[PDB]
Symmetry: D2
Subunit: 332 residues, 4 copies
């Protein structure tokens, strides 16, 4: 229809559902989340501390949540291979659990009867696509794909614009990133990421990230030319990339602005935004762009050495791109 | 007294810090099946709320080491298997939250510990609050509970007020710092839906049995108190707001005089007293159970008054755990 | 009704947003001697708490412009000089906090406005709270106050409870979001020492006259209520925790039934009612004065109960300012 | 003695006083702050939301605050030229108001009878000094000096070490900075810095900063080679610099670490620190270093292009350097 099902009803799953319910040609057929019951699901969907109450009627019955009359079947399988995606006629299963992110594990949705899978996270084996960057490379024989990460969606469109116009010799990126669900409210155990265990709302927390390197997977011409790191900070949503790049061709910051603005208003419209206003992170809450270039924050030291700044609602911008990729794959 | 700690969360770690500075307490062992020794040493050394441990912290294959004291570590999901017998543990301190009843805390005694202190309220293990009813501890009790941080804040003040003026009944609210059970962004919390909501961006109502539990350590107030909590985004330090109906007419100055005499007297180091313009961060690291805030309280009529008392919900309480350990060893 | 706003802080700006969506209100003018027009347009368009204005905002040499409506701006430290007469202003809305008494608010009438609404409690100007005593407004009153956000939250609930069960007396606490008077890091606040302390890292006790002021809009409760506040790090939305002694024995279900009937009936849009597992962020942008939280409240005995009600201290109150403006114009 | 007086009893003034009271050869003779009375001053000094209660007895009498027996005279002049610095025999007035930061205005303390002035902020006209970087350039004929800013104190010692060993061709810096007193608790007026007016604890807030350029004033060899920007975030204290540098000589990240560690343990001891642990910002609360290199957070993309990370308690590290500069100037 395209008919979709959502696996995992966390931050991304619930917002992907909000957005999908608003797309006329997307039908949300079901959701699966083993960690929450049907009445609880309707509560989590209705109330949102970051993005406000759902603007629509939410209720539930025995086996569904109901949103403005649309019934969405719920399930609670830990193992997605046991889901009824075949008899529910699911075209695309959207996996937002962060747990079935490889070809051999996302394959479980296709085994369960879905025709294709979109993974809402970077993958080492599933081909990655970023709207505005390489979605045109998608072909219909690929049944399992990745939408990369929020940070890669922010960085890649900007990197493409800059590379096309001036050439990126190399670049180092920092993202100052809002806190996320993997973090802890007070110092607790996080054996895979020790800094990530520390009180989230009372610290600046360095973290490694593969997001800048992954740009090289969606733009092969930048393979090996980008890397970066992150600092997690106490804001609840919205993040910003700070990309320090060495350019091949001398340029002025004024020319950089005009090229980004022209791409924002042209071919990357709705993906890359542009502003000259005195913005701060909360001004992008609910913003559906992948990347909003902040022209006034950036700074140029020399004709080929510049620091560029771009904002992103890491929850809402990314969830919109997920639904965009779903619809692209369905029309292709 | 030789102790072992089960659980190495906020309470387990701070109890360890405090225990290492008490000359009559020897920390023999720590159990936490989550963490490895290197990570345990890290979690112990660095603390976002109470600062770096001021001593040398290291580790080896079988221990974490603090200023030369080797602390043996184990990783037993089931405390029954722990080497308490062969470690000559006198008291097992269980800070996991999981073995908080007589029949589960027994696993430490089966493992050879002589006694157990549970760092949480219990339905079945007798509760004690220092300055309130630790006198009632008798040496035949092998398993006991130190109640909760909120009960330790409310009970000493309630005793003082009840003994002097009579509490007919009272409704309490605690404005409480966020806790480890909360979530950084709205996530699943099936037993406490409000508690799943973004911790640092909400005021979050919660139920609490702390006021009711005062009735267990002060039987004369059974049925006379109840209350509720609001969890807010500060990282530590909480405050009780107790609204009481009194049996005897009083003035707020007489209330202040009585609480201060108690803080300076029999409840010294448990109940504190201030008239200064304090805010929550002024009690970070404070070892009192309850610090009465004289200037914040307000009396509407001779038998109806709102009393306010602060507590470092981590540090005050962890200090009382070690106090109760020593009392149970000297008794 | 043609209105002018004095002051362009949190209340001034939100009153402007709400007023621009009321078809019977025309915003003629704004005064704030701090800001220039370009900056006024920016402060109006972007809002960290309530989002971007959903309309086009621009400015020129003498105006800020919102979806084609030109709003004349002035910069007069002394409202006496403002062109209210020659702007045919019916009601001057003073949100500065500075001209909150009869003899100072008079400056707007001297400048030619017909009437004034002061968006703060006043010692001398009569106070009105919608759903509580706006019926008592008489058209000869030129200068009136809309009380405070906390009074607007407490008074409608107190009226409902008092009318049904009788309030003998009550002590209130509000857990209140931080406000513009607070400081980002410990700094000078000579009139309110606790209020100078780092806003986002403390629970901060504060005094409030809001409960006492209920006695001004409901004379039958004069002397029967008082209370205090704790300011905490959330950016907006507050909650009242009202502990009342009742005249008539009741059950908590009868209390719920009465408040719900009122919320669905005569107090619709002023007092709301919920049983859901809400937290503060669920009322961001809510236009009610008071949302009774049925599941958070707790009854200890038949005449002693704790009632809980939420309020968006910016948005609910700004909505009531515009309601009172229109009521005073239709009266 | 050296005898000092403090002008301005804000974050820096109060912490400079805590530290000075602990230095045996520094005598704190007086403080001036027109915006607060004597009993209030004693309260602000005793209680601190960030750095805890003063460990010592604090009281007051009519005209002094008293700390562990030491009486410190208080004053309330808006115009520092009216202070009794001559009859109080003040050797060094420390101006921490952020308001008397030029030669011609700091001069007021010398007119009032102080022999020298140390300004606790960057200055356009007073010569700037950073301990560990160029304090040796101080000569006794200079009566009015600046200790630069906290960010410059963090960046300059690291920049010196890196430049000496590998040569800095150019560098772009970001500081992720804790909130400060100039910021607002909820959106309010800040006509000189519009982004700076926005709710401080609910936003990431870009800001311009001259701190990276100012490194060129204390290290002339780096004049024109550095610039940067800042993001203010909701933590209450402790900041971190993220310095992206182009090097003249190829190197490995491993060699960079060994050079920084050797400087931290040698000539820059107590100014530049070094760690390999999984630290987060709150681990540096109360830390007296200007700069603590975070070896595990940094990342190198190529042999001459690296991102380095260094922490600083912007309040406490800087206030310690103020007292250090005061004592250097007194012994010189
Ligand atoms: N939140 C962001 O800023 C953001 C941005 C871009 C990408 N992502 C990616 O999206 C994915 C989800 O992130 P999130 O922030 O929504 O996390 P989340 O914790 O908010 O949601 C994860 C959800 O999956 C559910 N779940 C866990 N195991 C499951 C299983 N076995 N079957 C079905 N459901 C299961 C959990 O109950 C939880 O509700 C992650 O991979 C994350 O990296 C997140
Ligand atoms: N922190 C407070 O404000 C506070 C105050 C007083 C009492 N308490 C009580 O103390 C208990 C712990 O609270 P906390 O804040 O320390 O939680 P926490 O998350 O900080 O610590 C709990 C720790 O126990 C460990 N653990 C879990 N299961 C275990 C098991 N099977 N065996 C050994 N270790 C295990 C976990 O890894 C975790 O680190 C709770 O019952 C709580 O009610 C908490
Ligand atoms: N914000 C709330 O939660 C809340 C709720 C209800 C009522 N109120 C009341 O409304 C009043 C304003 O509060 P706020 O939060 O809007 O403060 P605010 O700081 O956000 O706004 C006050 C504004 O008034 C302007 N101003 C100051 N003096 C002026 C004058 N001479 N002439 C014109 N403008 C002037 C200032 O520039 C400032 O921007 C206070 O009295 C407060 O008690 C506040
Ligand atoms: N806080 C930091 O992280 C930090 C770090 C490095 C440098 N600095 C610099 O130190 C200076 C002070 O910063 P702060 O953070 O202490 O600010 P603050 O607001 O905390 O302190 C400034 C104090 O000066 C007082 N004051 C204002 N005018 C005065 C005058 N006329 N005479 C006497 N006192 C006056 C104010 O009452 C206030 O208490 C600023 O220039 C700042 O840039 C601050
Ligand atoms: O289950 C329906 C939903 O709208 C919420 O009321 C929360 O329980
Ligand atoms: O200084 C000791 C510290 O490095 C360890 O405890 C954790 O890494
Ligand atoms: O979009 C309008 C906005 O730019 C101004 O109101 C402030 O800069
Ligand atoms: O004025 C003395 C000081 O120690 C504090 O008690 C706060 O008033
Ligand atoms: Na010991
Ligand atoms: Na209108």
């Amino acid at each position: 229809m395209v008919r979709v099902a959502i696996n995992g009803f966390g931050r991304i799953g619930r917002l992907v559902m909000r957005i999908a319910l608003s797309r006329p040609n997307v039908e949300v057929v079901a959701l699966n989340d083993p960690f929450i019951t049907n009445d609880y699901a309707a509560y989590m969907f209705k109330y949102d501390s970051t993005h406000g109450r759902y603007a629509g009627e939410v209720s539930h019955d025995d086996k569904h949540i109901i949103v403005d009359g649309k019934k969405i079947a719920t399930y609670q399988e830990r193992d997605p291979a046991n889901l009824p995606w075949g008899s529910s006629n699911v075209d695309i299963a959207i996996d937002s659990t962060g747990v079935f992110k490889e070809l051999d594990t996302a394959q479980k949705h296709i085994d369960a009867g879905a025709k294709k899978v979109v993974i809402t996270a970077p993958s080492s084996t599933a081909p990655m696509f970023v709207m505005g960057v390489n979605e045109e490379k998608y072909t219909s024989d690929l049944k399992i794909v990745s939408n990369a990460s929020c940070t890669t969606n922010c960085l890649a469109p900007l990197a493409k614009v800059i590379n096309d116009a001036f050439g990126i010799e190399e670049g180092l990126m920092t993202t100052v990133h809002s806190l996320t669900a993997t973090q802890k409210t007070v110092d607790g155990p996080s054996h895979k990421d020790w800094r990530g265990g520390r009180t989230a709302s009372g610290n600046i927390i360095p973290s490694s990230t593969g997001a800048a390197k992954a740009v090289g997977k969606v733009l092969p011409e930048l393979q090996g030319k980008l890397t970066g790191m992150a600092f997690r900070v106490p804001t609840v949503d919205v993040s910003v990339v700070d990309l320090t790049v060495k350019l091949n061709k001398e340029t002025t910051y004024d020319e950089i602005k005009k090229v980004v603005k022209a791409a924002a208003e042209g071919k990357l419209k709705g993906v890359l935004g542009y502003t000259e206003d005195a913005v701060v992170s909360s001004d992008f809450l609910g913003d559906s762009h992948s990347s909003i270039f902040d022209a006034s924050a950036g700074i140029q030291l020399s004709p080929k050495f510049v620091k560029l700044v771009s904002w992103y609602d890491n929850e809402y911008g990314y969830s919109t791109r997920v639904v965009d990729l779903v619809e692209h794959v369905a029309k292709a």
